[PDB]
Design a protein around this nucleic acid. Structure first.
Lengths: 227, 226
DNA sequence: CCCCCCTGTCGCCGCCGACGT
DNA sequence: ACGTCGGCGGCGACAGGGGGG
């Protein structure tokens, strides 16, 4: 629960401080390699494949291979070309209704909480967004990588926090080009009505509590057994 | 495109072959580690702390570190006690209304394709899902890592293809533990009026066609020149 | 028949939170 | 208020293996 950001929503001259937080913590256990035979921990050393000598991180040049198997070293001017990462602000772009963003695009979510002193503007903006029911699409620059996103409010009963849902660039989302479904499919009318009771026989209400990763809990119990 | 796997939905008697595909391909450019002195692609060697020698992938042992840091030598036979991952079926569990999954949980989107020469069952399932307007929650499994998902249908121009959206285990979604907002701040109606004025002055409608990553295009042009 | 893409590691840099002045 | 210090986490790259042609 340690922050990752400290910027400010800024559409004009507003600049409400916000502390971005990771909204999805993976309880999945990450293991570690080791040379158990001799009881020796493992480390990775970068070694030349052709010249065959170990090297340090500095020497290796970030290189790109094209269809011709070329290699170009990326210099500092590539960083200098885009100045957008130099900004520590979530530069709001536009305000749109929340219904205009499909669930196809959502990629990740973070929770924004403010600097304790500037709570007034935070709550005022969140209240205005909730009352007028508006998306607030923004930009986002975390660790020098500009990702589109969307800022939308969400009441939590006692408190109402606004959150940022990162978005995939509209071009990235793939388009389904499947000719099999295009060919005509004919179904007799009495056939369709049968499936209704089939699905209705299993209908229910989505409850988060019931579902749980049996694999992970079993692994946790097993490792507890090992110790 | 290229399928990630090819299984078949299954809830009791019902069955239907499906052919999943990747629906989010990131065209961000992958580079390779090279060093100027010789311009040779880097190579990685697994090297041993205690014994100070290269130790193969096969000769490498997996382990775990707990709070105390004590190493734990794990074995493959014991971990594999779970038999579900061996299943190659999208074993549907229940059917629920589509509007009962908040956008918090959606993780990845995957297309579906009927496999057999006949897609009658697939089309019928898509039609019933579209009519009744109910999501179908499934225990999607892939690459021996079972992960909860949900089946939903959405038309794309020419087809009524249905898609499976992976989901986050509800215990994964954190909560906003923040005692800084529960405090109530005095506010004035004029403040709300001016705030609404400023907010709606900049209001507009979503036009995704004009949204692109400037950095990616800049890098593409730079590499094209080089 | 296959070569691509998940998945897991590793190492690294960059950033935050508390202690002390 | 301001300066130090240690720790935590995105992420870029590689390696391995599966299941797709």
């Amino acid at each position: 629960m340690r922050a990752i950001w400290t910027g400010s929503i800024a559409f004009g001259l507003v600049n409400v401080p916000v502390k971005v937080y990771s909204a999805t913590a993976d309880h999945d256990i990450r293991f570690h390699q080791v040379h158990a035979k001799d009881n020796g921990r493992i480390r990775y050393k970068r070694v030349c494949e052709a010249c065959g000598e170990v090297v340090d991180y500095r020497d290796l040049a970030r290189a790109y291979e094209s269809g011709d198997g070329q290699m170009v070293a990326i210099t500092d001017d590539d960083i200098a070309s885009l100045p957008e990462e130099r900004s520590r602000e979530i530069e709001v772009l536009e305000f749109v209704p929340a219904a205009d963003v499909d669930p196809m695009m959502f990629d990740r979510s973070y929770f924004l909480e403010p600097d304790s002193k500037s709570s007034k503007s935070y709550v005022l903006l969140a209240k205005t967004l909730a009352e007028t029911d508006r998306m607030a699409i923004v930009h986002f620059t975390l660790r020098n990588k500009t990702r589109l996103a969307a800022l939308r409010v969400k009441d939590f009963g006692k408190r109402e926090v606004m959150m940022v849902h990162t978005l995939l660039w509209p071009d990235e989302i793939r388009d389904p080009d499947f000719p099999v479904l295009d060919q005509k499919v004919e179904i007799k009318p009495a056939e369709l009505k049968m499936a209704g009771q089939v699905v209705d026989s299993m209908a229910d209400d989505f409850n988060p509590d019931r579902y749980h990763d049996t694999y992970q809990e079993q692994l946790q119990e097993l490792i507890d057994t090992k110790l």
